[PDB]
Enzyme design. Structure first.
Site, PDB file in Angstrom:
ATOM      1  N   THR A   1      14.898  -6.720  -2.957  1.00  0.00           N
ATOM      2  CA  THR A   1      14.251  -7.153  -1.893  1.00  0.00           C
ATOM      3  C   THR A   1      13.852  -8.655  -1.395  1.00  0.00           C
ATOM      4  O   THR A   1      13.910  -9.495  -1.792  1.00  0.00           O
ATOM      5  CB  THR A   1      13.152  -6.863  -1.474  1.00  0.00           C
ATOM      6  OG1 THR A   1      12.844  -4.718  -1.509  1.00  0.00           O
ATOM      7  CG2 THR A   1      12.529  -6.609   0.439  1.00  0.00           C
TER       8      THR A   1
ATOM      9  N   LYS B   1      18.179  -5.807   0.141  1.00  0.00           N
ATOM     10  CA  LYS B   1      16.839  -5.447   0.757  1.00  0.00           C
ATOM     11  C   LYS B   1      16.555  -6.300   1.775  1.00  0.00           C
ATOM     12  O   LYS B   1      15.760  -6.811   1.184  1.00  0.00           O
ATOM     13  CB  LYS B   1      15.478  -4.126   0.172  1.00  0.00           C
ATOM     14  CG  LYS B   1      15.521  -3.863   0.942  1.00  0.00           C
ATOM     15  CD  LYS B   1      14.522  -2.958   0.536  1.00  0.00           C
ATOM     16  CE  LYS B   1      13.124  -2.020   1.259  1.00  0.00           C
ATOM     17  NZ  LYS B   1      12.575  -1.207   0.931  1.00  0.00           N
TER      18      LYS B   1
ATOM     19  N   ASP C   1      14.664  -3.141   6.283  1.00  0.00           N
ATOM     20  CA  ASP C   1      14.110  -2.291   6.628  1.00  0.00           C
ATOM     21  C   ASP C   1      12.997  -3.103   7.246  1.00  0.00           C
ATOM     22  O   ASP C   1      12.436  -4.041   7.390  1.00  0.00           O
ATOM     23  CB  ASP C   1      13.904  -2.451   5.274  1.00  0.00           C
ATOM     24  CG  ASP C   1      11.613  -1.028   5.319  1.00  0.00           C
ATOM     25  OD1 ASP C   1      11.821  -0.392   6.256  1.00  0.00           O
ATOM     26  OD2 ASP C   1      11.618  -1.550   4.447  1.00  0.00           O
TER      27      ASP C   1
ATOM     28  N   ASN D   1      10.302  -1.668   8.961  1.00  0.00           N
ATOM     29  CA  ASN D   1       8.565  -1.530   8.997  1.00  0.00           C
ATOM     30  C   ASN D   1       8.021  -0.657  10.049  1.00  0.00           C
ATOM     31  O   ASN D   1       6.749  -1.214  10.797  1.00  0.00           O
ATOM     32  CB  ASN D   1       7.527  -2.565   8.132  1.00  0.00           C
ATOM     33  CG  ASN D   1       7.657  -2.362   6.233  1.00  0.00           C
ATOM     34  OD1 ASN D   1       9.153  -3.230   5.582  1.00  0.00           O
ATOM     35  ND2 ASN D   1       7.655  -1.192   5.453  1.00  0.00           N
TER      36      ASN D   1
ATOM     37  N   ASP E   1      10.182   6.674   6.408  1.00  0.00           N
ATOM     38  CA  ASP E   1       9.994   6.062   4.882  1.00  0.00           C
ATOM     39  C   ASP E   1       8.642   6.614   5.496  1.00  0.00           C
ATOM     40  O   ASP E   1       7.484   7.585   4.847  1.00  0.00           O
ATOM     41  CB  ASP E   1       9.551   4.736   5.069  1.00  0.00           C
ATOM     42  CG  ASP E   1       9.182   3.652   3.681  1.00  0.00           C
ATOM     43  OD1 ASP E   1       8.213   4.752   3.221  1.00  0.00           O
ATOM     44  OD2 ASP E   1       8.932   2.831   3.292  1.00  0.00           O
TER      45      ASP E   1
ATOM     46  N   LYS F   1       9.255   7.957  -2.072  1.00  0.00           N
ATOM     47  CA  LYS F   1       7.393   6.929  -2.509  1.00  0.00           C
ATOM     48  C   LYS F   1       6.962   7.986  -3.657  1.00  0.00           C
ATOM     49  O   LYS F   1       5.371   8.852  -2.883  1.00  0.00           O
ATOM     50  CB  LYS F   1       7.278   6.202  -2.078  1.00  0.00           C
ATOM     51  CG  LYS F   1       8.141   4.942  -1.591  1.00  0.00           C
ATOM     52  CD  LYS F   1       7.607   3.765  -0.912  1.00  0.00           C
ATOM     53  CE  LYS F   1       8.328   3.086  -0.106  1.00  0.00           C
ATOM     54  NZ  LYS F   1       7.508   1.743   0.697  1.00  0.00           N
TER      55      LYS F   1
ATOM     56  N   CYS G   1       9.211   2.120  -3.923  1.00  0.00           N
ATOM     57  CA  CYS G   1       7.874   1.176  -4.333  1.00  0.00           C
ATOM     58  C   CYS G   1       7.077   0.782  -3.782  1.00  0.00           C
ATOM     59  O   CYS G   1       7.602   0.430  -2.227  1.00  0.00           O
ATOM     60  CB  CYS G   1       8.205   0.853  -5.550  1.00  0.00           C
ATOM     61  SG  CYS G   1       9.166  -0.735  -5.416  1.00  0.00           S
TER      62      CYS G   1
ATOM     63  N   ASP H   1      15.140   1.893  -4.237  1.00  0.00           N
ATOM     64  CA  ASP H   1      14.859   0.317  -4.608  1.00  0.00           C
ATOM     65  C   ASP H   1      13.606   0.069  -5.766  1.00  0.00           C
ATOM     66  O   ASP H   1      11.727   0.728  -4.849  1.00  0.00           O
ATOM     67  CB  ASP H   1      13.800   0.498  -2.665  1.00  0.00           C
ATOM     68  CG  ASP H   1      13.107  -0.807  -2.257  1.00  0.00           C
ATOM     69  OD1 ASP H   1      14.346  -1.831  -2.544  1.00  0.00           O
ATOM     70  OD2 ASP H   1      12.559  -0.489  -1.252  1.00  0.00           O
TER      71      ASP H   1
HETATM   72 MG   LIG Z   1      10.242   1.289   3.317  1.00  0.00          MG
END
Ligand SMILES: [Mg+2]
Ligand SMILES: [Mg+2]
Lengths: 341, 341
Positions: free
Chosen positions: A132, A157, A186, A188, A239, A263, A290, A315
């Site tokens: 990431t 990522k 991502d 978020n 997610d 996850k 994770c 990931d």
């Molecule tokens: Mg995510």
């Protein structure tokens, strides 16, 4: 039979502050879980709690050790489904539920003279993880992306979500210097439905392809996830919106996303197995992620991925950005690759 | 690793012809599957094909022995997920897919030093099966019901579907002489939506309660199943309409049924596991049934049921209707109860 369950605080410092939409951390505070059997066998797991995603606090996990002991001590690990049903009651302490369930399989596998991945099907012998690029200036982002690429990673990522204009710029610049790599973006939950769509279209128009576009909108906005899915060219993933098996059944019924980022810290082993099956019975695709696990913790996801072989992308790099005295996983880390021993 | 696979025809005669909607059998022609591992371990499974339900024919199954052997030999049973994925290609030979997948777990568990039920979770130590009353004159049905009741069975499965008026009378008469028992009614697709509803209402009006009302309508009539569910007082189950994990996802999405009668002979182990996870992630409840398995075949369902502990009712009595010299199940049969060794 289980005779002891130990929870202990373990702190790991990030080599550099990790910045994502609405969150910055430079340390990872986990709870290590050890299960001891009457035979002497010891299984290990790790909980990497998330206040933002699961509403957990590490101090709270540590406070319920006695309760956890009362819940499963005396139970034989060969009746692991009983331990799973019982630990599913810890839905308010997801990361701990995950750690306890994995430590149970870790102990059970040892007793059967095998490994967790094989207990789960032994579908694959190797998996590859991305790495990431946290939120920073476009310059720093490009610098880190360039370094990750040189390290051998072919899936990068990229975190975004706080500045649409700069996020687009960042993704475009990164693509330039990492030709040949796949990208996972991502946000978020940082974007509105329209911004999310605009982001994807902008990037698309420059000839850039995004393998997975993670949770662009707020967690409760299931309709928003669908809106982005139906109005932008890249596969959209849930997610934060996908924590339990019930959330996934709902996401599937609503045809809201192309992907679900599983996850163990959100679902535990029990719900993660249900999600794998749900995805294989529908058009849903999966990736595994994770939180802030150390190597001991990532070991749980590696065995899960290797065993089920249910993921298109992995990931699992939290342990790669942490200063850790020594490797504690029951797997081999070879660059972006992770293999069974 | 598997070094060889052998298929063998095995016949079992019934004590009396078994009559269900549109079908009468006097014998069960199954295909025994044996898997041989380099270690010398041998795993066993049994395929009880169904022409009516799966479109299978025993001669066709025996005809692809070499193909099956070529498909799985050389694979380590600890990588059973690979075997599952490969055998999933035998969707046209579901009973064989089941026998092979179980033989795999049977061999693996021996190598690991445990039993299949524990491999699947070890959820329960005991389960109870019902016993079936085939179609016959009301007089003979009542006689057989009383006999089943005296043998200790407390869940009695009643076949119907060819004569609504007589079917109603049959159930009403059976209920009078078996006070204390629960009833499962299986129409095997014999009623129209409306007749199915009238059957249930009539039985309900007499104060009789039906635990599970199995497949009242034709297999393709999903809307019909839903219609009966929304207009009848008893839980409605899909059997012939629920063969694969994909059929079940559709049934859930459409809210067509309360129950799904899982049969390894229709789904194999792989799909059955997926169906259990789908049911636990939704309002769906499950029961587990059988085709014409002998004791070795029923053993497969007993271990699946004991291990997952996912079923409300168990209809595993096919071996109790067959003449068999030696019991070949890896479980203890104590009246209606079945326990792990
Ligand atoms: Mg995510
Ligand atoms: Mg049936």
């Amino acid at each position: 039979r289980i005779v002891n369950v130990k929870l202990s605080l373990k702190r790991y410092e990030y080599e550099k502050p990790f910045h994502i939409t609405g969150s910055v951390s430079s340390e990872s505070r986990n709870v290590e879980v050890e299960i001891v059997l009457e035979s002497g066998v010891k299984g290990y797991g790790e909980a990497s709690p998330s206040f933002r995603v699961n509403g957990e606090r590490v101090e709270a996990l540590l406070a319920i050790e006695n309760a956890v002991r009362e819940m499963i001590t005396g139970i034989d690990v060969r009746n692991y489904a009983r331990i799973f049903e019982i630990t599913d009651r810890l839905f308010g302490f997801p990361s701990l539920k995950a750690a306890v369930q994995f430590a149970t399989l870790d102990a059970l596998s040892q007793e059967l003279g095998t490994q967790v991945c094989y207990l789960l099907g032994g579908k694959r012998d190797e998996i590859e993880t991305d790495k990431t690029v946290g939120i920073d200036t476009v310059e720093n982002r490009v610098k880190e992306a360039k370094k990750i690429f040189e390290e051998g990673f072919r899936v990068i990522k990229i975190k975004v979500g706080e500045n649409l204009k700069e996020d687009i710029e960042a993704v475009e610049e990164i693509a330039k210097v990492t030709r040949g790599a796949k990208y996972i973006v991502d946000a978020n939950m940082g974007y509105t439905q329209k911004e999310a769509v605009e982001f994807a279209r902008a990037v698309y128009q420059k000839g850039i392809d995004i393998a997975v576009y993670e949770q662009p909108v707020r967690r409760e906005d299931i309709e928003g996830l669908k809106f982005v899915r139906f109005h932008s060219p890249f596969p959209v993933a849930a997610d934060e919106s996908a924590r339990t098996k019930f959330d996934v059944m709902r996401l599937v019924k609503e045809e809201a996303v192309d992907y679900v980022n599983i996850k163990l810290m959100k679902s535990g082993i029990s719900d993660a197995l249900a999600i794998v099956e749900i995805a294989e019975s529908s058009g849903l695709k999966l990736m595994i992620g994770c939180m802030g696990e150390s190597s001991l913790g990532i070991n749980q996801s590696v065995h899960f991925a290797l065993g089920t072989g249910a993921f298109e992308f992995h990931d699992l790099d939290s342990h790669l950005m942490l200063k850790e005295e020594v490797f504690r996983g029951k797997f081999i880390q070879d660059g972006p690759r992770m293999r069974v021993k």
